[PDB]
Design an enzyme around this catalytic site. Structure first.
Site, PDB file in Angstrom:
ATOM      1  N   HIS A  85      31.877  46.626  48.086  1.00  0.00           N
ATOM      2  CA  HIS A  85      32.144  47.412  47.038  1.00  0.00           C
ATOM      3  C   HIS A  85      31.103  48.017  46.046  1.00  0.00           C
ATOM      4  O   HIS A  85      30.026  47.371  45.885  1.00  0.00           O
ATOM      5  CB  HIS A  85      33.442  47.131  46.001  1.00  0.00           C
ATOM      6  CG  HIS A  85      34.674  47.133  46.555  1.00  0.00           C
ATOM      7  ND1 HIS A  85      35.748  46.184  46.250  1.00  0.00           N
ATOM      8  CD2 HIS A  85      35.374  47.919  47.487  1.00  0.00           C
ATOM      9  CE1 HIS A  85      36.896  46.251  46.894  1.00  0.00           C
ATOM     10  NE2 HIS A  85      36.555  47.385  47.859  1.00  0.00           N
ATOM     11  N   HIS A 148      39.318  38.919  46.944  1.00  0.00           N
ATOM     12  CA  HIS A 148      39.290  40.186  46.491  1.00  0.00           C
ATOM     13  C   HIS A 148      39.026  41.132  47.442  1.00  0.00           C
ATOM     14  O   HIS A 148      39.310  42.449  47.288  1.00  0.00           O
ATOM     15  CB  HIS A 148      38.555  40.247  45.148  1.00  0.00           C
ATOM     16  CG  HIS A 148      38.118  41.459  45.096  1.00  0.00           C
ATOM     17  ND1 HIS A 148      38.540  42.254  43.858  1.00  0.00           N
ATOM     18  CD2 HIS A 148      36.952  42.342  45.657  1.00  0.00           C
ATOM     19  CE1 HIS A 148      37.852  43.350  43.763  1.00  0.00           C
ATOM     20  NE2 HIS A 148      36.830  43.435  44.614  1.00  0.00           N
TER      21      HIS A 148
HETATM   22 ZN   LIG Z   1      35.187  44.877  44.682  1.00  0.00          ZN
END
Ligand SMILES: [Zn+2]
Length: 230
Positions: A85, A148
Site C-alpha cells: 500500500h 490486512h
Molecule cells: Zn494498507
C-alpha cells in the site's frame, strides 16, 4: 506525549524515541475524507539507520529524511516496506533519490507493481511462507501469513523487544478494522496469533496507525477482526 493526528500539520513529520536506538516516525495523510496518522520505524544499524516504511508519500518522506538528519545525524542506507500500500511504499522514489536502498518481499513487489504504486528496488528472500523469519541487520522480519493484506510483514527489534505490527495490528482506541479492501479477514486473526506466539517477549507493540502499547494490541486486534466478521 506520543504525537497524535491533531498536532501534525500534513507534510510534517515527528520522531518519537521508543527505546535506545529505536524510533518511530509519525506523519499524516488525507484518506477517505479523513486525515490519518501513520507510523513507521527507524532503527540504529550500528553505523547507519535502517528505515521501516515510508512516511506515506513523497512530501512526507522528504520531510522524514530531513527530520532524521536534524535529529539523529546518521545516514539512512536501507528501507523495508512491510506492504504494497501507498502508506508503505509511497515515497520510495524519494528514498532512492536520497541514496537509500529499498527492499520489499517479492510478494510486496508484485502486488505494488500491479497497482501502480512506487516499487522497492530489492527483493527480500526468505519470507514467502507463513511463519517465516529472516534477519535484516538489527531487526527480524516475520511473515505472519495474511492479515490486512496478503503480504503484510511485521518487524521485531530483538535488542529492544519492540514489535512493529505494521498495518496488521490496530491501536487500542481503534474500533473498526481499517481499509479492508485487500484484507484476508478469515485468515487475519490466525495470523495475529502467529505473531503472539513468535514474539512473546515483546515489551512494546507499534501499530500501523496510532498509539503504541503492549501485547494487548494483538489481542485487541483479534477481537476487532472477529467483530467486523458478522
Ligand atoms: Zn494498507
Amino acid at each position: 506525549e506520543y504525537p497524535t493526528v491533531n498536532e501534525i500539520p500534513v507534510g510534517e513529520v515527528r520522531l518519537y524515541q521508543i527505546a535506545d536506538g529505536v524510533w518511530s516516525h509519525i506523519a499524516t495523510q488525507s484518506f477517505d475524507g479523513a486525515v490519518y496518522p501513520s507510523n513507521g520505524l527507524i532503527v540504529r544499524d550500528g553505523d547507519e539507520l535502517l528505515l521501516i516504511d515510508t512516511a506515506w508519500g513523497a512530501k512526507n518522506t522528504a520531510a522524514l529524511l530531513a527530520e532524521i538528519e536534524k535529529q539523529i545525524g546518521l545516514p539512512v542506507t536501507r528501507a523495508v516496506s512491510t506492504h504494497f500500500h501507498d502508506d508503505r511504499v509511497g515515497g520510495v522514489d524519494v528514498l532512492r533519490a536520497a541514496g537509500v536502498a529499498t527492499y520489499a518481499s517479492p510478494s510486496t513487489r508484485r502486488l505494488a507493481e500491479a497497482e501502480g504504486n512506487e516499487i522497492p528496488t530489492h527483493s527480500l528472500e526468505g519470507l514467502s511462507s507463513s511463519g517465516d523469519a529472516v534477519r535484516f541487520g538489527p531487526v527480524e522480519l516475520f511473515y505472519p501469513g495474511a492479515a490486512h493484506s496478503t503480504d503484510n510483514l511485521v518487524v521485531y527489534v530483538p535488542s529492544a523487544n519492540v514489535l512493529y505490527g505494521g498495518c496488521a495490528v490496530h491501536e487500542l482506541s481503534r474500533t473498526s478494522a481499517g481499509n479492508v479492501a485487500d484484507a484476508d479477514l478469515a485468515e487475519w486473526p490466525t495470523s495475529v496469533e502467529r505473531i503472539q506466539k513468535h514474539y512473546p517477549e515483546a515489551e512494546v507493540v507499534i501499530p500501523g496507525h496510532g498509539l503504541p502499547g503492549g501485547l494487548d494490541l494483538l489481542q485487541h486486534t483479534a477481537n476487532v477482526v472477529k467483530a467486523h466478521k458478522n
